[PDB]
Amino acid sequence: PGATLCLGHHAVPNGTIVKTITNDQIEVTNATELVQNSSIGEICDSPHQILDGENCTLIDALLGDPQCDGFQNKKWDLFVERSKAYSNCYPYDVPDYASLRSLVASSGTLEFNNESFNWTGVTQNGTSSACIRRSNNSFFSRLNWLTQLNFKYPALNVTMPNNEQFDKLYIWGVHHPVTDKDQIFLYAQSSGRITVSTKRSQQAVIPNIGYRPRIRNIPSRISIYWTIVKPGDILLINSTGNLIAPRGYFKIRSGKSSIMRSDAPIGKCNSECITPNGSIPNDKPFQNVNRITYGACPRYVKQSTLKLATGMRNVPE
């Protein structure tokens, strides 16, 4: 009679379908998912330093909008801007807003050092009902609204050397009065001019008088500019009117910092990978949660699922 000896392999009743080169669908004994498709719906506060902008855009925290005073000098790995954020100070715009926002975000610090600019012969610390701070008329914390004194506005020609070992970022602006009358009432003379220069740059701005739609009852505007001053260089401000002067400089750092638009709440938890939807686990190589990411993250793909076989072909009995 003898014996019979048969070689075989296992099989399972509940197999899973995968794709190979040979087959669009083949059942295997087991598989694992390579596409992360869910977030936990909150941005974990660890291990990255999160700064929740709350009602403040980064630019409003920079200029010093009154509701953003709590942000002075803070640092971040990720600044989170909320869709509800709104400005509540003198109405302004920033030509190339997106670039100023990007470079501050990437710098990752609001550290500000005050400097003593020699502003002789003008009225300082101008304020407005459009920018209320603790019940009083006020202004952007980091800017100095200069106007005429004793019906005169003597031409400004002020220098600030950078004798530090780091770059200085200066934020300044131009007031665009609503009428030719207001130009006179504020600055003495019928047309202002601003020239801000260094050894390696110059920026020249002329105000544009006129009506804009009222924002917090103000039909005029401020336009914001910026200037970087390297070590051994000099800021030179030369102006016959309309200057919204800097009070000092922001430190500008380089590193890994960024900014993200999200309405997800901040949670007390620890997760490497952040998306606008919330933190996501980063065990899988791919993800279809969001193309916007910060940190050690799976790569964004369009597939909602990719199954990697972790067992042999399943051939039920």
Partner: protein, 169 residues
């Protein structure tokens, strides 16, 4: 009657991925082969370790959603991102297809290796039934079957008996 790996798997083998079923004069049984099982598992763990927990840090990038219409610069930012996503999506699709092909090939390979190894132990003393099974032409008790499974089977011990059985009319 018992049957081999060509045409089906064994749902009743729960303690291994590959193994042996036998019929002899002491009964019928099953035993997992741990070496072949482990060889497949190690390779699959090898893949998993390359693909899992290996993400790449990125920090400040470009914007990818826009509240206002702008034209040229925004067209470019969008096209750069779309381009990138399509290329990664392609890489992911191909990678999984190639990996899964290789997994099916390596797991099929361990089955074939175990079969061939068994065939080469038995030699002369058995016939390949074409279905993953061997007909062994000598008395082969549980210890004998065990010796085949453990790679200690000496075909010379049974050769006389086996040939006498095969080549009688």
């Amino acid at each position: 009657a018992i049957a081999g790996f060509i045409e089906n798997g064994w749902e009743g083998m729960v303690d291994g991925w590959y193994g042996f079923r036998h019929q002899n004069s002491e009964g019928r049984g099953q035993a997992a082969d741990l070496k072949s099982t482990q060889a497949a598992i190690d390779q699959i763990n090898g893949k998993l370790n390359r693909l899992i927990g290996k993400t790449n840090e990125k920090f400040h990038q470009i914007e990818k959603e826009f509240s206002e219409v702008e034209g040229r610069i925004q067209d470019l930012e969008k096209y750069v991102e779309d381009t990138k996503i399509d290329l990664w999506s392609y890489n992911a699709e191909l990678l999984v297809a190639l990996e899964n092909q290789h997994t099916i090939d390596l797991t099929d390979s361990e089955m074939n290796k175990l079969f061939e190894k068994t065939k080469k132990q038995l030699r002369e003393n058995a016939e390949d039934m074409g279905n993953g099974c061997f007909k062994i032409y000598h008395k082969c008790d549980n210890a004998c079957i065990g010796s085949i499974r453990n790679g200690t089977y000496d075909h010379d011990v049974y050769r006389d008996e086996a040939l006498n059985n095969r080549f009688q009319i």
